[PDB]
Write an enzyme that holds these catalytic residues in place. Structure first.
Site, PDB file in Angstrom:
ATOM      1  N   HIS A  62      64.439  34.545  17.440  1.00  0.00           N
ATOM      2  CA  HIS A  62      64.197  33.192  16.502  1.00  0.00           C
ATOM      3  C   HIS A  62      63.926  33.941  15.086  1.00  0.00           C
ATOM      4  CE1 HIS A  62      63.513  31.775  20.562  1.00  0.00           C
ATOM      5  NE2 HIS A  62      62.545  32.489  20.868  1.00  0.00           N
ATOM      6  N   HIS A  92      56.072  37.167   9.561  1.00  0.00           N
ATOM      7  CA  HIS A  92      57.496  36.749   9.768  1.00  0.00           C
ATOM      8  C   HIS A  92      57.721  35.818   8.752  1.00  0.00           C
ATOM      9  CE1 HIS A  92      54.983  33.815  12.173  1.00  0.00           C
ATOM     10  NE2 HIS A  92      55.917  32.990  11.657  1.00  0.00           N
ATOM     11  N   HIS A  94      60.419  32.105   7.804  1.00  0.00           N
ATOM     12  CA  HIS A  94      61.373  31.158   8.269  1.00  0.00           C
ATOM     13  C   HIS A  94      62.334  30.657   7.020  1.00  0.00           C
ATOM     14  CE1 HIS A  94      58.838  29.850  11.778  1.00  0.00           C
ATOM     15  NE2 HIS A  94      57.597  30.179  10.923  1.00  0.00           N
ATOM     16  N   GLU A 104      58.557  25.636   6.225  1.00  0.00           N
ATOM     17  CA  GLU A 104      58.248  24.474   7.223  1.00  0.00           C
ATOM     18  C   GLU A 104      57.245  23.626   6.362  1.00  0.00           C
ATOM     19  OE1 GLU A 104      56.832  27.554  10.305  1.00  0.00           O
ATOM     20  OE2 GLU A 104      58.906  26.669  11.364  1.00  0.00           O
ATOM     21  N   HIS A 117      54.760  33.791   6.767  1.00  0.00           N
ATOM     22  CA  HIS A 117      53.584  33.507   7.744  1.00  0.00           C
ATOM     23  C   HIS A 117      52.943  34.896   7.923  1.00  0.00           C
ATOM     24  CE1 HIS A 117      55.117  29.459   8.997  1.00  0.00           C
ATOM     25  NE2 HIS A 117      54.565  29.341   7.671  1.00  0.00           N
ATOM     26  N   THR A 196      53.922  27.033  14.788  1.00  0.00           N
ATOM     27  CA  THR A 196      55.010  25.983  14.509  1.00  0.00           C
ATOM     28  C   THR A 196      56.178  26.351  15.303  1.00  0.00           C
ATOM     29  OG1 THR A 196      55.888  27.575  12.909  1.00  0.00           O
ATOM     30  CG2 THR A 196      54.281  25.901  12.178  1.00  0.00           C
TER      31      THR A 196
HETATM   32  C1  6ZX Z   1      52.448  33.447  16.422  1.00  0.00           C
HETATM   33  C2  6ZX Z   1      53.465  32.540  17.379  1.00  0.00           C
HETATM   34  C3  6ZX Z   1      53.813  31.333  16.973  1.00  0.00           C
HETATM   35  C4  6ZX Z   1      54.185  30.885  15.487  1.00  0.00           C
HETATM   36  O1  6ZX Z   1      54.234  31.763  14.687  1.00  0.00           O
HETATM   37  O2  6ZX Z   1      54.122  29.752  15.362  1.00  0.00           O
HETATM   38  C5  6ZX Z   1      53.453  32.779  18.917  1.00  0.00           C
HETATM   39  C6  6ZX Z   1      54.338  32.684  19.641  1.00  0.00           C
HETATM   40  C7  6ZX Z   1      54.468  33.050  21.015  1.00  0.00           C
HETATM   41  C8  6ZX Z   1      53.100  33.090  21.640  1.00  0.00           C
HETATM   42 CL1  6ZX Z   1      52.917  33.508  23.319  1.00  0.00          CL
HETATM   43  C9  6ZX Z   1      51.793  33.058  20.980  1.00  0.00           C
HETATM   44  C10 6ZX Z   1      51.910  32.972  19.434  1.00  0.00           C
HETATM   45 ZN    ZN Z   2      55.655  30.971  11.261  1.00  0.00          ZN
END
Ligand code: 6ZX
Ligand code: ZN
Length: 258
Positions: A62, A92, A94, A104, A117, A196
């Site tokens: 992703h 990370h 986007h 976003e 983020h 998100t």
């Molecule tokens: C940190 C995150 C998502 C995001 O960045 O929206 C995320 C992703 C999978 C799990 Cl299980 C918990 C948090």
């Molecule tokens: Zn993010």
């Protein structure tokens, strides 16, 4: 679960496996700068990253996550709208296929090229998995990227991406200083929201910096050479891994600045 960002598994589909996708505090949102209100009681924001210990960078199919040692209070976010201490676990981005999309959050409907983020969890809940189950479990620091001059503090990230081209690849990523990704000003907007990506849990205090950082076209071009697919699968470029703006509903965005 087989969520993603394509026509067939993208943000419009997510609600079927993750009904909270249509919830009351989903993220991102559009930040209307003429409706957000200066909140004079916001305490100062405190970004304490001097002791940060980065460990690894992972392509998760992703995006890519830069992961930190969060076993003690080494890199923490406090102050602003937050009560208590929030520990940095990962950052990370986007980004888009083109420089006019990728972020976003949007600002008066403006989309940036990308968005960073920095994800932190509330240490009173003991671990990240417990924290995501609480309305005040996470604080995510959001930073917009625009295409202009190169960001020197980003280049170490760009240069390792060749080694994690495909889903499931990871690489050692020690001694990275996340302070190099910050703009000059910590002026911010804040609102309560969600993750998100799936599972889209409603556990985030969003803190979005007003001042974007500039990165070079070459830098963002290298983000766009990553792959959503695994090694030896047909190539799908990792682009447009952003969820669009969600209804604000019964929320107020507060500004830290006049
Ligand atoms: C940190 C995150 C998502 C995001 O960045 O929206 C995320 C992703 C999978 C799990 Cl299980 C918990 C948090
Ligand atoms: Zn993010």
């Amino acid at each position: 679960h087989h969520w993603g960002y394509g026509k067939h598994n993208g943000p419009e589909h997510w609600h079927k496996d993750f009904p909270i996708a249509k919830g009351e505090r989903q993220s991102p949102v559009d930040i209307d700068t003429h409706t957000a209100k200066y909140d004079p009681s916001l305490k100062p924001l405190s970004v304490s990253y001097d002791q940060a210990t980065s460990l690894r960078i992972l392509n998760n199919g992703h995006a890519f996550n830069v992961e930190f040692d969060d076993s003690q209070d080494k890199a923490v976010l406090k102050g602003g709208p937050l009560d208590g201490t929030y520990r940095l676990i990962q950052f990370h981005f986007h980004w888009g296929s083109l420089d006019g999309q990728g972020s976003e959050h949007t600002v008066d409907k403006k989309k940036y090229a990308a968005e960073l983020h920095l994800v932190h969890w509330n240490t009173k809940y003991g671990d990240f998995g417990k924290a995501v189950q609480q309305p005040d479990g996470l604080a995510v620091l959001g930073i917009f990227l625009k295409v202009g001059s190169a960001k020197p503090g980003l280049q170490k990230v760009v240069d390792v991406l060749d080694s994690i081209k495909t889903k499931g690849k990871s690489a050692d990523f020690t001694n990275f200083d996340p302070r190099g990704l910050l703009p000059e000003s910590l002026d911010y907007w804040t609102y309560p929201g969600s993750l998100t990506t799936p599972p889209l849990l409603e556990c985030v205090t969003w803190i979005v910096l007003k001042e974007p950082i500039s990165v070079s076209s070459e830098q963002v071009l290298k983000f766009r050479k990553l792959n959503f697919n695994g090694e030896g699968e047909p190539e799908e470029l990792m682009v447009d891994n952003w969820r669009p703006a969600q209804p604000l509903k019964n929320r107020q965005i507060k500004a830290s600045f006049k």
